[PDB]
């Protein structure tokens, strides 16, 4: 499957694509404002994610650090990124269908649209100004808006035991982006697409 990753932001993003224990395609690439990168994701991939990383500093070897979404200090990500990260999430070819969503469970950094290239299903978007509205306690000093689990590290927010429910911090994200997951046990906003669809992930969408 093809995923076209398009940066419409005024600023550079270092796009990242991983399934948690391996890169998807090259795993990461610098996208200056206005640039795009098309990757191929293998069929059957489960638990894939695409995200933006902001304010990265890499050396010639592809080693360094990003202010949001860093993946083990690498340009070419093999693992998932440090919160805060708006996440495009997908599993492909699952009983004949693909499943896509956006999540704010690990916070929000860059506004995102995640859309199929087919008319057979609809896209989802989280592009409200979450960073400008972020409560002081959730602000990340390097940019972005942390989720409350990252900040407070209690099960109330991390859903590690029992049955967590919404909180004032999950509701902050959820009201701004109803179509994105706001905590682990949020009512799902996953979209079912025809199996083997292709997609576009747009940073700073407007359309």
From Swiss-Prot:
Its main location: cytoplasm. SMART domains: THN. Keywords: Cytoplasmic vesicle, Disulfide bond, Signal, Taste-modifying protein. SUPFAM superfamilies: Osmotin, thaumatin-like protein. It holds the Pfam family Thaumatin. Belongs to the thaumatin family. One of its GO terms (cellular component) is cytoplasmic vesicle. Disulfide bonds join 9-204, 56-66, 71-77, 121-193, 126-177, 134-145, 149-158, 159-164. It is found in: Cytoplasmic vesicle. The keyword Disulfide bond applies. Taste-modifying protein; intensely sweet-tasting. It is 100000 times sweeter than sucrose on a molar basis. This is Thaumatin I. InterPro entries: Osmotin/thaumatin-like_sf, Thaumatin, Thaumatin_CS. The keyword Disulfide bond applies.
């Amino acid at each position: 499957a093809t995923f076209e990753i398009v940066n419409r932001c005024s600023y550079t993003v270092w796009a990242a694509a991983s399934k948690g224990d391996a890169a998807l395609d090259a795993g990461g690439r610098q996208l200056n404002s206005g640039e795009s990168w098309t990757i191929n994701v293998e069929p059957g991939t489960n638990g894939g994610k695409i995200w933006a990383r902001t304010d990265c500093y890499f050396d010639d070897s592809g080693s360094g650090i990003c202010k949001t979404g860093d993946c083990g200090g690498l340009l070419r990500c093999k693992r998932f990124g440090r919160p805060p990260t708006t996440l495009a999430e997908f599993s492909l070819n699952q009983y004949g269908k693909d499943y896509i969503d956006i999540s704010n469970i690990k916070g929000f950094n860059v506004p995102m649209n995640f859309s199929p290239t087919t008319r057979g299903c609809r896209g989802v978007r989280c592009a409200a100004d979450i960073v400008g509205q972020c409560p002081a306690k959730l602000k990340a000093p390097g940019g972005g808006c942390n989720d409350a689990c990252t900040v407070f590290q209690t099960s109330e927010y991390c859903c590690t035991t029992g049955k967590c429910g919404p909180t004032e911090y999950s509701r902050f994200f959820k009201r701004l982006c109803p179509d994105a997951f706001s905590y682990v046990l949020d009512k799902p906003t996953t979209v079912t697409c025809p199996g083997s669809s292709n997609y576009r992930v747009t940073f700073c969408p407007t359309a």
